[PDB]
């Protein structure tokens, strides 16, 4: 059985998105067939094995350290930090990069929506000392007590860079890949808890 | 293992197919990246050297008695098709420990400038209620970023007669194909990185 939060049932809701000029929507209104509180617990709850599965579902993510729970707790103002290594295409860049991820709970209301903001640094990529990646993961109620996910991203430039265009695009396209894995791994965790594995 | 098959063009901007999802359809895997040009991946799965597809099938530990795979006839083009068979061992089964799988593949669309659509129709006679359905699985291949290939697989059950196990079969099929598609992707990524 999958973790639950209250309320377990709710009418569809809308996140309070503050889109900016530099922001691109990666995926929008992506449905996940389980109540909001369940999905929030899968990605962000105290059993961090599910988030661990989300990251290692991408073959290119390696050396994933253990994911801590959110402290002080899973609530607005909570945060956590972890790292892993992402293999890249070495013809357009370096063969891999460390990824230093900070997640901050910006808003958490299971009656309405959840906003977890990822701030990520990639020290090994060209111009990696000039920017951080901001990724906003919104979770909200979809139809029939399901969950919709929307992900928005931008580059926070802390210094000027000659790679500005390549980094913003690579970041968007790379995150289409990673969010598609996250959505698929979440859908798999839900469908595996509900049914018997018919092979293997 | 030394050189991979090619088709032209070898380079192209990203494309996306009309996956035409309906209410009875389920996504198996979507937008899975394969780091090789579209014509290369198409040749690996469907080209006349069928050794690569044979390797894809036998990479799945649940597949046994994998016969030689024929090429598409009349040839690899829209309207071409092929037929092959193997046996899939089952896990938490309600019936037998394994089932024969009778596969027909049809090329519904093939344009290396755009996308390729191969539809698999599979019959599993030995499973409970197996005389009431065939499995339809659509494999879409299209251009991803940087001259790579994206794959999307969508599946539904074609019920030819009434069935009371309808719910479990539709779910068992999605779950089993998630497994087999992940094995296919890992073998394809294996073949490309070894080249
Ligand atoms: C900065 C580089 C692009 C560099 C372009 C260059 C220098 C090779 O031309 C991009 C490409 C891949 C991006 C990662 C993809 C996915 C994620 C997961 C998400 O949860 C957190 C952000 C992260 C790690 C992206 C960071 C920026 C990356 C490395
Ligand atoms: C019909 C059964 C599920 C129902 C079994 C029941 C009712 C006993 O639980 C499913 C489970 C495994 C499914 C196969 C998984 C893999 C593939 C490969 C794909 O390329 C072609 C379809 C096929 C053979 C699935 C057929 C349906 C199967 C046997």
Instruction: Give the count of beta carbons closer than 10 Å to the beta carbon of residue B115.
Output: 22
Please count the helices (runs of H) and the strands (runs of E) in chain B: 3, 7
Q: How was this structure determined?
A: X-ray
Test A199 with B145 for CB contact under 8 angstroms.
no
DSSP string, B141-191: EEE-GGG-EEEEEEEEEEESS--S-HHHHHHHHHHHHHHHHHHHHHHHHHH
Environment class of A17 (CB within 10 Å of its CB; exposed 0-12, middle 13-18, buried 19+): middle
DSSP-assigned letter for residue B137: E
At residue B70, the 3 state secondary structure works out as coil
DSSP string, A116-178: EEEEEE-TTSTTTTSEEEEEEEEEEE-GGG-EEEEEEEEEEESS--TTHHHHHHHHHHHHHHH
Whether residue A173 lies within 8 A of chain B, CB to CB, comes out as yes
Q: What are the Cα distances from residue B18, in Å, to B15, B119, B137?
A: 10, 14, 15
Test B90 with A198 for CB contact under 8 angstroms.
yes
By CA distance, what is A169's nearest residue in B? B145
User: Sheet containing A61-62: which strands, arranged edge to edge?
Assistant: A24-32, A147-157, A131-141, A113-121, A96-109, A79-87, A61-62
Contacts of B74 (CB under 8 A, 6+ apart): B80
Which residues 45-64 of A have a C-beta within 8 angstroms of B? 59
Test B171 with A195 for CB contact under 8 angstroms.
yes
C-alpha span between B29 and A180 (Å, rounded): 9
DSSP-assigned letter for residue A100: E
Kind and range of the H or E run holding B80 = none
Instruction: Report yes or no: B37 and B10 within 8 Å, Cβ to Cβ.
Output: yes
C-alpha span between A175 and A115 (Å, rounded): 17
Joined together, the tokens standing for residue B125 give 């006679």
Q: Give this entry's resolution in angstroms.
A: 2.2
Residue B86 φ/ψ, nearest 5 degrees = -160, 180
Residue B129 φ/ψ, nearest 5 degrees = 70, 15
Contacts of B120 (CB under 8 A, 6+ apart): B103, B104, B105, B135, B136, B137, B138, B139
Whether residue A197 lies within 8 A of chain B, CB to CB, comes out as yes
- B137 Cβ below 6 A of ligand 2: yes
A174 CA → ligand 1 middle, Å: 6
Nearest to B153 by CA among B114, B189, B179, B191: B179
Joined together, the tokens standing for residue B192 give 């490309």
Which residues of chain B are within 8 Å of residue A180 when distances are taken between CB atoms? 30-31
At residue B24, the 3 state secondary structure works out as coil
Whether residue B92 lies within 8 A of chain A, CB to CB, comes out as yes
Joined together, the tokens standing for residue B95 give 């019936």
Nearest to B180 by CA among B35, B57, B44: B57
Nearest to B35 by CA among B195, B189, B191, B190: B189
Test B146 with A89 for CB contact under 8 angstroms.
yes
C-alpha span between A120 and A135 (Å, rounded): 8
Report the DSSP beta bridge partners of residue A132.
A156
Contacts of A151 (CB under 8 A, 6+ apart): A25, A26, A27, A28, A135, A136, A137, A138, A175, A179
Which residues of chain A are within 8 Å of residue B31 when distances are taken between CB atoms? 176-177, 180
Q: What are the Cα distances from residue A101, in Å, to A70, A108, A140?
A: 13, 19, 23
Q: Which atom of ligand 1 is nearest to the CA of A171?
A: 10
C-alpha span between B5 and B11 (Å, rounded): 14
Nearest to B153 by CA among B19, B16, B18: B19
Exposure string for A136-166, b = 16+ CB within 10 A, e = fewer: bbbbbbbeebbbbbbbbbbbeeeeebeeeee
C-alpha span between B145 and A180 (Å, rounded): 15
Residue A176 φ/ψ, nearest 5 degrees = -55, -45
Instruction: Report yes or no: B174 and B153 within 8 Å, Cβ to Cβ.
Output: no
Half-sphere exposure of B174 (CA within 13 A, CB side): 22
Test A199 with B35 for CB contact under 8 angstroms.
no
Contacts of A32 (CB under 8 A, 6+ apart): A39, A142, A146, A147, A148, A149, A183, A186, A187, A190
Q: What are the Cα distances from residue A155, in Å, to A85, A178, B116?
A: 19, 16, 35
> How much helix, strand and coil, in percent to the nearest 5, is found in chain B?
25, 35, 40
C-alpha span between B135 and A136 (Å, rounded): 39
DSSP-assigned letter for residue B69: P
Instruction: Report yes or no: B62 and A199 within 8 Å, Cβ to Cβ.
Output: yes
By CA distance, what is A198's nearest residue in B? B91
Instruction: Give the count of beta carbons closer than 10 Å to the beta carbon of residue A45.
Output: 20
- A167 Cβ below 6 A of ligand 1: yes
Q: Write down the residue that tokens 């509900």 correspond to.
A: A194
Query: Which residue of A89, A177, A200 is in closest CB contact with B179?
Result: A200
Positive or negative torsion for Cα B104, B37, B155, B53: positive
């Amino acid at each position: 059985t999958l973790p639950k939060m209250e309320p377990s049932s709710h009418a569809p809701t809308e996140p309070d998105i503050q889109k900016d000029k530099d922001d691109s929507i990666i995926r929008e209104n992506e449905n996940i067939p389980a109540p909001l509180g369940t999905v929030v617990q899968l990605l962000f709850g105290s059993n961090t094995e599910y988030m661990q599965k989300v990251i290692t579902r991408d073959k290119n993510n390696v050396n994933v350290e253990t994911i801590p729970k959110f402290t002080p707790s899973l609530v607005e103002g909570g945060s956590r930090h972890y790292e892993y290594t992402k293999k890249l295409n070495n013809s357009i860049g370096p063969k891999q990069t460390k990824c230093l991820l900070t997640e901050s709970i910006e808003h958490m209301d299971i009656n309405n929506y959840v906003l977890v903001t990822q701030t990520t640094k990639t020290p090994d990529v060209p111009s990696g000392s000039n920017f951080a990646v901001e990724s906003k993961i919104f979770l909200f109620w979809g139809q029939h007590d399901t969950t919709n996910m929307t992900v928005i991203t931008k580059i926070n430039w802390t210094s000027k860079s000659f790679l500005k265009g390549a980094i913003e695009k690579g970041s968007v396209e790379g995150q289409k890949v990673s969010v598609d894995y996250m959505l698929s791994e979440l859908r798999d965790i839900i469908s595996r808890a509900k049914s018997k594995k018919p092979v293997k």
